[PDB]
Motif scaffolding. Sequence first.
Motif, PDB file in Angstrom:
ATOM      1  N   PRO A  78       0.745  -1.274   0.000  1.00  0.00           N
ATOM      2  CA  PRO A  78       0.000   0.000   0.000  1.00  0.00           C
ATOM      3  C   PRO A  78       0.763   1.305   0.000  1.00  0.00           C
ATOM      4  O   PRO A  78       1.738   1.441   0.734  1.00  0.00           O
ATOM      5  N   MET A  80      -0.904   4.120   0.720  1.00  0.00           N
ATOM      6  CA  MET A  80      -1.744   4.952   1.571  1.00  0.00           C
ATOM      7  C   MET A  80      -2.632   4.022   2.378  1.00  0.00           C
ATOM      8  O   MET A  80      -3.159   3.041   1.857  1.00  0.00           O
ATOM      9  N   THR A  81      -2.785   4.329   3.657  1.00  0.00           N
ATOM     10  CA  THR A  81      -3.604   3.521   4.548  1.00  0.00           C
ATOM     11  C   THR A  81      -4.879   4.280   4.899  1.00  0.00           C
ATOM     12  O   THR A  81      -4.894   5.514   4.898  1.00  0.00           O
TER      13      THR A  81
ATOM     14  N   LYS B  26       1.372  -9.257   3.046  1.00  0.00           N
ATOM     15  CA  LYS B  26       0.796  -7.935   2.976  1.00  0.00           C
ATOM     16  C   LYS B  26       0.145  -7.617   4.315  1.00  0.00           C
ATOM     17  O   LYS B  26      -0.682  -8.405   4.782  1.00  0.00           O
ATOM     18  N   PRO B  27       0.481  -6.436   4.939  1.00  0.00           N
ATOM     19  CA  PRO B  27       0.496  -6.280   6.407  1.00  0.00           C
ATOM     20  C   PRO B  27      -0.673  -6.789   7.219  1.00  0.00           C
ATOM     21  O   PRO B  27      -1.819  -6.584   6.831  1.00  0.00           O
ATOM     22  N   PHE B  28      -0.410  -7.456   8.334  1.00  0.00           N
ATOM     23  CA  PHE B  28      -1.496  -7.854   9.213  1.00  0.00           C
ATOM     24  C   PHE B  28      -1.703  -6.885  10.360  1.00  0.00           C
ATOM     25  O   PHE B  28      -2.576  -7.129  11.196  1.00  0.00           O
ATOM     26  N   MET B  29      -0.948  -5.793  10.406  1.00  0.00           N
ATOM     27  CA  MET B  29      -1.048  -4.778  11.445  1.00  0.00           C
ATOM     28  C   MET B  29      -0.312  -3.547  10.950  1.00  0.00           C
ATOM     29  O   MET B  29       0.765  -3.647  10.366  1.00  0.00           O
ATOM     30  N   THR B  30      -0.904  -2.385  11.176  1.00  0.00           N
ATOM     31  CA  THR B  30      -0.314  -1.126  10.749  1.00  0.00           C
ATOM     32  C   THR B  30       0.182  -0.354  11.967  1.00  0.00           C
ATOM     33  O   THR B  30      -0.352  -0.514  13.069  1.00  0.00           O
TER      34      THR B  30
ATOM     35  N   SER C   4      -9.713  -1.488   8.339  1.00  0.00           N
ATOM     36  CA  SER C   4      -8.433  -0.952   7.913  1.00  0.00           C
ATOM     37  C   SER C   4      -8.077  -1.552   6.567  1.00  0.00           C
ATOM     38  O   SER C   4      -8.056  -2.772   6.412  1.00  0.00           O
ATOM     39  N   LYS C   5      -7.807  -0.693   5.598  1.00  0.00           N
ATOM     40  CA  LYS C   5      -7.626  -1.089   4.211  1.00  0.00           C
ATOM     41  C   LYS C   5      -6.411  -0.345   3.703  1.00  0.00           C
ATOM     42  O   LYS C   5      -5.662   0.248   4.481  1.00  0.00           O
ATOM     43  N   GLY C   6      -6.222  -0.357   2.398  1.00  0.00           N
ATOM     44  CA  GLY C   6      -5.144   0.415   1.835  1.00  0.00           C
ATOM     45  C   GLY C   6      -5.210   0.408   0.333  1.00  0.00           C
ATOM     46  O   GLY C   6      -5.768  -0.500  -0.277  1.00  0.00           O
TER      47      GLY C   6
END
Lengths: 101, 50, 51
Positions: A78, A80-81, B26-30, C4-6
């Motif tokens: 990504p 952008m989040t 592909k991320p599991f936590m931001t 939460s996405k992106g």
Amino acid sequence: GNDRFEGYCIDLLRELSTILGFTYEIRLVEDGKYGAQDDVNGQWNGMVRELIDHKADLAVAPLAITYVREKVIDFSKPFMTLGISILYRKPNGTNPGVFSF
Amino acid sequence: IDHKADLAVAPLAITYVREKVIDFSKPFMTLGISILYRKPNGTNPGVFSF
Amino acid sequence: LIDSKGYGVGTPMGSPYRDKITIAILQLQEEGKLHMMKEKWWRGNGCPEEE
Ligand SMILES: CCCCCCCC/C=C\CCCCCCCC(=O)O[C@@H](COC(=O)CCCCCCCCCCCCCCC)COP(=O)([O-])OCC[N+](C)(C)C
Ligand SMILES: *[C@@H]1O[C@H](CO)[C@@H](O[C@@H]2O[C@H](CO)[C@@H](O)[C@H](O)[C@H]2NC(C)=O)[C@H](O)[C@H]1NC(C)=O
Ligand SMILES: O=S1(=O)NCN(C2CC2)c2ccc(F)cc21
């Protein structure tokens, strides 16, 4: 040319062109949709249709990573989040409070 | 890199340098980097504050 | 936020660019350019409640 456009995902595409090295032809999608598997038969629309049919090479646009789109195209990682959130008017009134003293 | 593992399920943050040597999912936590510091000890107005 | 996405540069199924766009995004993010571009557009009028 490519000089018709501006914005975030146009400034991003310049920076991806400088780092990796390519020339790019920004073409507006004809449908005006992004991607939606029509549940009557199963067919894609918009940009995701023009990546499955190999009419495009990139999809630099607000194309949110979902479960269903990832099984038919391959996203990058990504830039952008975000999340879904509620938009609503500000309340334009004031609480009277006659016993404010 | 030495193929002694198959997954790396741990807080292994996606950086530029690690991505060129292994392949992340592909991320599991931001997240992000942020400052940790003590709370200031508070106020305690005395009862004879007047 | 509800979920939460992106976003992400979409490539066709099995393109060799998604491992080069991924590198060129992670490079722009540590240089601070993905924040520098977002501050150029999403600010606009910095609306106060001022009163
Ligand atoms: C402009 C209007 C003026 C009117 C009156 C003027 C006259 C003089 C008035 C007040 C003079 C008081 C001396 C000043 C003290 C300095 C501060 C201090 O040391 O605080 C101490 C308070 O502990 C006390 O000393 C409370 C004493 C109150 C006095 C009673 C008022 C007079 C009564 C009526 C007079 C008429 C009676 C009728 C005839 C008999 C403790 O220190 P602290 O750190 O601040 O406290 C927090 C810590 N703690 C929470 C654990 C406690
Ligand atoms: C700020 O708070 C800290 C945390 O309480 C204080 O330091 C210690 O507090 C504990 C409380 O259990 C005591 O047992 C220690 O003896 C304290 N350390 C000392 C006195 O060196 C600290 O004193 C406070 N500082 C200020 C400026 O308020
Ligand atoms: O759609 S993702 O690639 N994977 C899911 N997640 C985390 C689970 C919240 C996130 C979190 C932040 C993103 F920017 C992207 C994603």
